[PDB]
Design a binder for this molecule. Structure first.
Ligand code: HEC
Ligand code: HEC
Ligand code: HEC
Ligand code: HEC
Ligand SMILES: [Ca+2]
Ligand SMILES: [Ca+2]
Ligand code: NA
Ligand code: NA
Lengths: 376, 125, 354, 376, 125, 355
C-alpha cells in the first residue's frame, strides 16, 4: 500500500537520522527490460513534445526525452538504444526547418547521434508508429515522406549519416523484414515489397490485392518484427494477418475480432493504437466499444483478446477508463498497457485477467503512442 | 458529450465542435485565435492543400463539400480543439484523411499547425 | 427581339460572305461539330488556325465558344487582379467588342474595313429584312451601324442555351440524376483539393450556380513557345507573346505573360491545349503542372517530345504560389483527373469522347 | 446575449443563403486601441510560450504571438509596435542558445525586426514586466542581465541592432524616464538613476534609501511611464510611491491599501501582478485576500481601489474568481483586467463597479502577464 | 486545499507539495520525472547555483537550510508541479528568491528548467 | 594514558631538541600565538618557512594544525576521489605518519636520522620517564620504537580540544548562544549558495557534527607559482609542484596540480594564503575565484600586484565544473564572505582579528 513518494520519504528521513551522505548527481535510468514502456505525447500538434520512459512494473517515470514537431519514436527491440525522427524550426514554429534523427543511450538518455535529414523530408502527421522504422539489425532507420510524393528515406545509424530517398509507388507505412527489405501498404490494396541496396533504384514487388476499396484498414496496425507478423484491423474489426517471416508475404486466414451479432449491435474498434500483438502467446488485443461508424478515433472502454491462429475470443475486458491506445509487454505474464489521451494517464493492467494494477498520470498534454521492446 | 454516439450537426455556433462544417475537422477552430470561419489569424500562413468531407447542413438539408485548409507557421492555438471524422478514411486515402498536417503550399514553407478553416467549395456527390 | 436577334446571329455565324474571299465563316474555325473549335490541320497541326487567304496562320489556338457567354466584362477587381473579357489575352471587353475583330483581321477573315462588311450584308435580301426589323431602316447603309449590329447579333447568338447547355455528366451528377464512377469521383476530389481549384473554379468558396471551371483571372503558368506554331504564324523568332500586357490600356509590367484561365468544359474534345496549342494530349496538359512540384526526372520531360518542356516564353509573373503546391500528381491521380475532365463534355459531344 | 460564435454562425448562414463570396485569406488584427489587452503565458517554465492579443471590449482573441523560454513582452504606449526579448535553443531545450529581440507590426503581427543578443545575456526568470522596458520615444529596448552580474543591455530598435551592455550596481528592474535614462531598485533600499551613452561608464546616482531592509518590495510594481509614477507595494500592502516626472526621484507619502483591522485579520496582497495604476484617474488597484504571510504568490479574490494622493479607499471588489494578475485599460470608464493562472482565463471587469462583464478562456497553460498600451 | 492557509509541512511523502523540504520550491519535484529527492533525472544537467530556505522538519523539530538546485537542459517535466514561498524574498535578495531559473553552473551551459531537487546543506541560523 | 600520551606530545611539540642545531621546534613554525602558523619574516615574507639551519626555505606555506585531527586517514572513495591525509599533497596517511617527517627533513628540523632523534630523547630524564611509562622500558634505546613513539605522542597532542576547541562565533551561533550580524549572515548565505560549499563543507548534503569547512578532497584551482617563494626554496625555475601526484603510489596524471582543500577555520588570522602563500590578503584569495566567472577586466588582475594572476603552475586538471559557476561575486558579497570567514576564528585568536 506504500507509495513510491512515501517510501522515498522514509529513506530520506533514515539517511538524515543516520548521518548518511550522498552526492547530488545525474541518475542513470535502470537497465532496459521487458517491462520498460515508452509513452509519446504529440501534444495535440504542439511545436515541441515529450516522451516518457516508464518502468511498467513499478509504475514509475524513469526518464524523459524532448522532441520537436510530431516526432516519430522507435525503440530497438534488444534494448541497445532508442531513437526518434524529429522536426524543429529556428523561431519556435516559424523560420528555417531542420529535420533530424537522434539516437539515445537508453540508460543515460544522452544523444549519441544527431543526424540531419536534408531538404526537410519528414512526413508531418498524427503519430503512426510504422511511419518510421528500424531494420531488424538496428543499423538502419527508415522514415516515410509524403511530399511531394510517397518516398522512403534511408538513414544509416551505424555511420551516422543520411544516405538517400527511395522512390516508391502510392504506398504507406514501412515494415522492415531484413537489413535491406521492407513492406508498405498501397492504395490499390496490395502490399509492396521494397528491396534496396547500396545504390540504385529499389526492386519493388507487389502482392495480390488482399482487400477491397470499401474495406478500410486502420492507421495503427501492430507489427512484430521478430515474428514478421503484420496484424491489420479494419474499421469493422475484421483482422488481416500477413506472415512476412519467409521474406515474402503470405496471407493468413482472415479473422473477425467481433461476432456478427456484436457488429449489428454497433460494436466497432475505436481509438488510436487500437490493436496489440503478443508474439510469444500469438495473441491479438483490440480496443472495442459500441459506437457510430464515423466515431472511429474516439476512446474505447473495452478490450477483446483472441487467438491469432483460430480467432477464438479468449477474453473481453471492461477497461474502466476512456482508453485510446493499447500495447503489451512481450514477456511472460504480460502487462496490458492502456493509455488515455483525455486523462493523460497510462493505466497498467494484467493481460491475463484485465485487472488494473497501477497507473502513471500527468503524461503531457495529449499522450497517444505506447512503445515497448521485444527483448525475449 | 457521449463521444461514441452518432455526431449531430448544428448551425448555430461555429466555435462549438458540433458545428455542421466541422464534420471532419482535426485541430483547432481558427475563429478562436483571431481568424474566422474561412480566414486565417494574422501572422499565420494559409495552406493551399486541403482535405475534404461531405458535411450535411441540418438547416437547408443539403450536403456540402468542406475543403479544410490549415493556417500554418504558428504553434497550435490551444483554443476550441475539435476532432471529428465524418467520412474520414485512413492515410492511404489522403484526400479524406485528417491526421495529416495539410500545410503544403503555405507561404514561407510554413508547416507547423495552428488551426483549420472550414470553407464550402461545392455541393456533395 | 431576343429570339430574333439570336436567329440573325445564327445566320451570320455560318456565313462566309463575312470573309474577304468568302472562304470562311465563324463556323469554319469555331466548328459546332468540334465544340466550336478548329478540326483543320495546318502548318503547325491543330495548334493554330488558317485564315481566309489560305496561307496566313495565327499565333494562338482557336478556343471553344461554348460557355464564353458566362464570362464577365473585362475589369479590374478590388484585389487588383484583372478578370473577364474575351481572347486569350483579354484584349476585347466582351462578346460584342470581340465579334468584329476576326472580321477585320488580315490573318483571319480579312475584310478591308467595316464598309466592306456592310456592303456584303446589303447584298443579302434576308439580311436587309432581318437587320432592318431589329435595328431600323437603312441600318445596312451605315457601315458603323451595320458592323455594330452584326456584332450584337453574333454575341446574342453565342448567349443562347445551345452554346451553354450545362448537360455534361458533371451537370447531371450535380442534379442528383446519376453518380460518378469511382475513378471519376476520385478525379473530382483531386480537382477540388489540389491546386486546380484555385484557378479553375468560379468562386473562392460557396457553390456556383453555373460553374464553368475558370475564375476568369489571368495567370502566367510558364509555358514554352510552340516552335512550329510560332514558325507558322510568321510573327518571327524575335517575337514574344506578352499575353494580357498586349491589351491596350494595360501598362502594368506584372501582367506580362499572363493569359485568361480557360473554361475546362469540353476540354477532352478541344485539343490541342494552352494558348498556343503546344500540347496535343489532355494528359500532357495535366502533367505539365507536375513540373513545378515533382522532383522525379520524368517531370522535366514533355512525354510528347521526350525532351525538356522548354524555358517559359515569359520568365516573370509566374503564378508560383499557386503552382508550387508541394504535391506531385502520380499516374493514378492523372488518370482520375482525365476521367473527371471527360465528365465536363456536353451531351452532344460525348460521341467525340471515343 | 448572443455569443461571438452564434453571431458568426448567423452571418455564415446568411452568406451561404445569399450566395455571397469571400476569399480565404490572412486577416489583419483590428487597429490597436485603448481596450486592446495582451496576455502572456510563461506556461510554467515551458521552453516555448504564447502571447494572446485580445480585444477587451468584445472579449475576443484577435491575434497570437509565439515566444521561447520565459520571454519579456513590451508594448509601445502609442500602439505603433509590440516587441519581446526571447530565448530559443537548437534542440528544444538543449544545445546552442540564441537570445533575440523581435519587433512586430501591431495589425499583421509580422516580425519587422529580429535582433540577436550576443553571448546569451537575458535574465531567465518568472516573468517580470519591468525586467525589459522601452524608452519613452520607443527607440530603445532595455533588458536586464543577472549573470554573471547585474547589467542592462541596450538594444537600438530604430537601427535594429544590439548596442552594448551596461555595468550597474547591485540593483534590479528598469524604469525608463528618458531616451538615455532609467531607474533601478537596489539591494541597499535606494533607487539607482542610470544615465547612459553609446560608450563610457554611465552616470550612476543613488537616491536616498526609502525603505527598511525588512519591508519587502514585490517583484511586480506598477510603473506609468507617461506619468513618471512608480507604485511599489510591500508584502503588507503598504505602498511606496515615487514621482520620477522631474527626471529625479521624489518620494511621495506612503499609503496603506489595507486598514489596520484588515491587517490584524490576515489581509495581505498576493498573486503575481498584484498592483495596477490608472494614470488619468490617479488610482491604485491591489489584489488582496486573507492569507498567511508566506503565501504572497497565491491567487487573490479581492481588489481594493484607492486614491493615490490621499490613500482613501474608493472600493473593494469581490472578484468571484482566483485572480493572480490585474491591470487596467488607460482610457475613460476603464476596464479592470483580472487574470487567473489556474483557470487559464482573463476576466474582464468594469473598473468602476467591479462587475464582471465578459471572459476570455483557454489562454495557454499558465498565463501570468497582462499588458495594455497607454494611448491617452 | 486552501491555497491561502498557512503551509503545513509533513515528512511522509516527497511527491506532495506539502513535503517539508519543499517549503520554498518553485517548479517541479524531480522525483516525479526519473530523478530522486536529491538527484537529477537522466539527460538533465545539475546546476551548481542554488536558492536557499529554512524549512522546518516536523520529524525532528529542526529547521534545515535547503539549497534548492535545478536540473536543467530539458523542457519542464510537467509532473508534480509545486510552488511554495516560506521565507521567500523578492528578486533583489536573490539568495532567497525563487522565480529565478537557478541553472547557472550546469554542464553544457544548460539553462532551461526541468525540475528542482531538495538537498539539505546545513542547519538554519 | 590518554591524558599522559597527549601530555608527552605537548612536551615534544615545544622542544627544540628535536632539531639538528636545536634552534627549532614544531612550535617555531606552528606557533600557538598565530593559530599554529609561522609569524617569522623570511626571504619570501611569510609565504614559506625557514628551517633549523637558518637558511633553507620550504616551497610550501606552513598550514595551521588547528582541526587537522578531524581529517580522515588518506584513502580513495568509491567515486574515485582521493580524500584525507596530511600535507598539502596528502603524501602522509595521517597525523602519526606526518609527525616524523619535519624531524628528518633537511630543509626543516634537519635531524640526520632516527638514531639521532632517539639520542636526544635519551639525554632528557623527563623523556626517559614519560616515554617508558607509556611504551615500556628501553623504548628510547630502539631508534625505530622511539621515533614511532614520538610521532604517536605528537599525533595524540594534536587531537586534544586545545587544537580544535569549536568555540568560534560561528559555533556559538550554531548552538543558539548568539546571532550573526546582517553582514555575516549574508556572508554565510552566500557561502552556502555559491560554489564555496562544493569544496569547503564536510558533506555533500545533510549536516556535519563537527564542521571544519573542507571536504578533504584534492583540487587544482589553477594558482600561479609564488615567484619569490619558489626562488627562496631553490627548487629551480623548471620545477613543477605536482601536488597529489607527488605522493608515492599515485601515478594518475589527472591528480597533477591538485592540493588538499584546507579547512577554513582560523583563515582570517593564518595569512598569507594558498599552498605557496601567494596571496597576502584574505580578500585577494576570495577575489581569485572571480577569475573563473567575472568578465570585468579587473577580474584578471591580482589587486596586490596590479598584474595578471598568472599562468597556472599546472594548467591541466582544473576543477572548472565547480569554479566556472556563471556568477560573479560583487564587492558587497566579498565583504560579506570576509565577515563570515572571520566568524571561523577560534575565541582565543579573536584579538588577532584586528591586525
Ligand atoms: C481563322 C479562324 C477563325 C475565325 C474565322 C474566327 N475566329 Fe474566333 N478565334 C480564333 C482564334 C485563333 C482565337 C484566339 C485569338 C487570341 O486569343 O488572340 C479566337 C477567339 C474567339 C473568342 C474568344 C473566346 C475566349 O474564350 O477567349 C470568341 C468569342 C470568338 N473567337 C468568336 C468568333 C466569332 C463570332 C467569329 C465570326 C465573326 C469568329 N470568332 C471568327 C479563330 C477564328
Ligand atoms: C495558377 C492558376 C492555375 C492553376 C493552379 C491551374 N491552372 Fe490549368 N490553366 C491555367 C491557365 C492560365 C491556363 C491557360 C494557360 C495558357 O494557355 O497560357 C490553364 C490551362 C489548362 C488546360 C488547357 C485547357 C485549354 O483549353 O487549353 C487544362 C486541361 C488545365 N489547365 C487543367 C488544370 C488541372 C488539372 C490543374 C490541377 C493540377 C490546373 N489546371 C491548375 C490556370 C491554372
Ligand atoms: C620549518 C618550519 C616547520 C617546522 C619546524 C615543522 N613544520 Fe609542520 N609544516 C610545515 C610546512 C611548510 C608544511 C606543509 C608542507 C607540505 O604540505 O608539504 C607543514 C605541514 C604539517 C602538517 C599537515 C597539516 C595539513 O593541513 O596538511 C602537520 C600535521 C604538521 N606540519 C605538524 C608538525 C609537527 C608535529 C612538527 C614538529 C615535529 C612540525 N610540523 C614541524 C612547516 C614546519
Ligand atoms: C573546486 C573546489 C573549491 C571551490 C569551489 C572553492 N574552493 Fe577555496 N580552496 C580550494 C582548494 C583546493 C584550496 C587550496 C588551493 C591551493 O593552495 O592549492 C582552497 C583555498 C581557499 C582559501 C585559502 C585558505 C588557506 O588556508 O590558504 C580561502 C580563503 C578559500 N579557498 C575560500 C573560498 C571561497 C570564499 C569560495 C567560494 C567563492 C571558495 N573557496 C571556492 C577548493 C575550492
Ligand atoms: Ca484547344
Ligand atoms: Ca596560510
Ligand atoms: Na508544335
Ligand atoms: Na611572493
Amino acid at each position: 500500500q506504500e507509495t513510491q513518494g512515501q517510501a522515498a520519504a522514509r529513506a530520506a528521513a533514515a539517511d538524515l537520522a543516520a548521518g548518511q551522505d550522498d552526492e547530488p548527481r545525474i541518475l542513470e535510468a535502470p537497465a532496459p527490460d521487458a517491462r520498460r514502456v515508452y509513452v509519446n505525447d504529440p501534444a495535440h500538434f504542439a511545436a515541441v513534445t515529450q516522451q516518457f520512459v516508464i518502468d511498467g512494473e513499478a509504475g514509475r517515470v524513469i526518464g524523459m526525452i524532448d522532441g520537436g514537431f510530431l516526432p516519430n519514436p522507435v525503440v530497438a527491440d534488444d534494448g541497445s538504444f532508442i531513437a526518434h525522427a524529429s522536426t524543429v524550426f529556428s523561431r519556435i514554429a516559424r523560420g528555417e526547418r531542420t529535420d533530424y534523427v537522434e539516437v539515445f543511450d537508453p540508460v543515460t538518455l544522452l544523444p549519441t547521434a544527431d543526424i540531419e535529414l536534408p531538404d526537410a523530408p519528414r512526413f508531418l502527421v498524427g503519430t503512426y508508429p510504422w511511419m518510421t522504422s528500424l531494420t531488424p539489425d538496428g543499423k538502419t532507420l527508415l522514415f516515410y515522406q509524403f511530399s511531394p510524393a510517397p518516398a522512403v528515406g534511408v538513414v544509416d545509424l551505424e555511420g551516422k549519416a543520411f544516405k538517400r530517398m527511395l522512390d516508391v509507388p502510392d504506398c504507406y507505412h514501412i515494415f522492415p523484414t531484413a537489413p535491406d527489405t521492407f513492406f508498405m501498404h498501397c492504395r490499390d490494396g496490395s502490399l509492396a515489397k521494397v528491396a534496396f541496396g547500396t545504390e540504385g533504384t529499389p526492386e519493388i514487388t507487389h502482392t495480390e490485392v488482399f482487400h477491397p476499396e470499401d474495406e478500410f484498414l486502420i492507421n495503427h496496425p501492430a507489427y512484430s518484427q521478430k515474428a514478421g507478423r503484420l496484424v491489420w484491423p479494419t474499421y469493422t474489426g475484421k483482422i488481416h494477418q500477413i506472415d512476412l517471416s519467409s521474406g515474402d508475404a503470405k496471407f493468413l486466414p482472415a479473422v473477425e475480432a467481433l461476432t456478427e451479432a456484436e457488429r449489428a449491435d454497433g460494436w466497432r474498434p475505436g481509438g488510436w493504437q487500437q490493436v496489440a500483438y503478443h508474439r510469444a502467446l500469438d495473441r491479438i488485443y483490440l480496443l472495442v466499444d459500441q459506437r457510430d461508424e464515423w466515431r472511429h478515433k474516439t476512446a474505447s472502454r473495452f478490450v477483446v483478446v483472441l487467438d491469432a491462429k483460430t480467432g477464438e475470443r479468449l477474453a473481453k475486458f471492461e477497461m474502466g477508463h476512456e482508453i485510446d491506445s493499447i500495447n503489451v509487454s512481450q514477456d511472460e505474464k504480460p502487462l496490458l498497457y492502456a493509455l488515455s489521451t483525455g486523462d493523460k494517464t497510462l493505466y497498467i493492467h494484467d493481460a491475463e485477467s484485465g485487472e488494473e494494477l497501477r497507473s502513471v498520470n500527468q503524461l503531457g498534454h495529449g499522450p497517444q503512442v505506447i512503445t515497448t521492446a521485444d527483448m525475449g | 458529450t457521449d463521444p461514441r454516439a452518432k455526431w449531430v450537426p448544428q448551425d448555430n455556433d461555429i466555435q462549438a465542435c458540433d458545428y455542421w462544417r466541422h464534420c471532419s475537422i482535426d485541430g483547432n477552430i481558427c475563429d478562436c485565435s483571431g481568424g474566422s470561419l474561412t480566414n486565417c489569424p494574422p501572422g499565420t500562413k494559409l495552406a493551399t492543400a486541403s482535405w475534404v468531407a461531405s458535411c450535411y447542413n441540418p438547416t437547408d438539408g443539403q450536403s456540402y463539400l468542406i475543403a479544410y485548409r490549415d493556417c500554418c507557421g504558428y504553434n497550435v492555438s490551444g483554443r476550441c480543439p475539435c476532432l471529428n471524422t465524418e467520412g474520414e478514411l485512413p492515410v492511404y486515402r489522403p484526400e479524406f484523411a485528417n491526421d495529416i498536417i495539410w500545410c503544403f503550399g503555405a507561404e514561407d514553407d510554413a508547416m507547423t499547425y495552428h488551426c483549420t478553416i472550414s470553407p464550402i467549395v461545392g455541393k456533395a456527390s | 427581339a431576343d429570339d430574333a436577334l439570336a436567329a440573325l446571329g445564327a445566320q451570320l455565324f455560318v456565313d462566309p460572305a463575312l470573309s474577304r474571299n468568302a472562304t470562311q465563316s465563324c463556323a469554319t474555325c469555331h466548328d459546332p461539330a468540334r465544340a466550336f473549335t478548329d478540326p483543320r490541320e495546318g502548318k503547325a497541326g491543330l495548334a493554330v488556325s488558317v485564315g481566309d487567304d489560305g496561307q496566313s496562320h495565327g499565333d494562338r489556338n482557336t478556343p471553344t465558344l461554348g460557355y464564353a457567354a458566362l464570362v464577365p466584362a473585362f475589369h479590374r477587381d478590388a484585389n487588383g487582379k484583372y478578370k473577364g473579357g474575351q481572347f486569350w489575352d483579354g484584349r476585347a471587353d466582351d462578346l460584342k467588342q470581340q465579334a468584329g475583330q476576326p472580321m477585320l483581321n488580315p490573318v483571319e477573315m480579312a475584310m478591308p474595313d467595316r464598309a466592306a462588311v456592310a456592303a456584303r450584308l446589303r447584298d443579302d435580301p434576308a439580311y436587309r429584312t432581318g437587320f432592318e426589323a431589329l435595328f431600323g431602316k437603312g441600318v445596312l447603309d451605315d457601315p458603323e451601324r451595320a458592323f455594330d449590329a452584326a456584332a450584337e447579333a453574333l454575341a446574342a447568338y453565342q448567349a443562347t442555351g445551345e452554346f451553354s447547355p450545362f448537360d455534361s455528366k458533371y451537370d447531371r451528377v450535380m442534379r442528383g440524376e446519376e453518380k460518378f464512377t469511382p475513378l471519376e469521383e476520385f478525379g473530382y476530389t483531386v480537382f477540388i483539393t489540389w491546386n486546380c481549384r484555385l484557378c479553375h473554379m468560379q468562386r473562392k468558396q460557396g457553390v456556383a450556380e453555373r460553374e464553368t471551371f475558370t475564375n476568369f483571372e489571368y495567370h502566367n503558368i510558364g509555358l514554352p513557345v510552340n516552335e512550329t506554331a510560332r514558325e507558322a504564324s510568321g510573327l518571327g523568332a524575335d517575337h514574344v507573346d506578352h499575353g494580357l500586357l498586349a491589351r491596350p490600356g494595360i501598362e502594368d509590367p506584372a501582367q506580362s505573360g499572363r493569359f485568361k484561365v480557360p473554361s475546362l468544359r469540353n476540354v477532352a474534345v478541344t485539343g490541342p491545349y494552352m494558348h498556343n496549342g503546344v500540347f496535343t494530349d489532355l494528359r500532357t496538359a495535366i502533367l505539365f503542372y507536375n513540373k513545378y512540384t515533382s522532383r522525379r526526372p520524368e517531370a522535366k520531360i514533355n512525354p510528347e517530345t521526350g525532351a525538356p518542356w522548354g524555358e517559359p516564353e515569359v520568365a516573370r509573373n509566374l503564378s508560383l504560389a499557386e503552382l508550387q503546391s508541394g504535391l506531385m500528381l502520380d499516374d493514378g491521380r492523372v488518370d482520375a483527373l482525365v476521367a473527371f475532365l471527360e465528365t465536363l463534355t456536353d451531351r452532344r459531344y460525348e460521341p467525340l469522347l471515343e
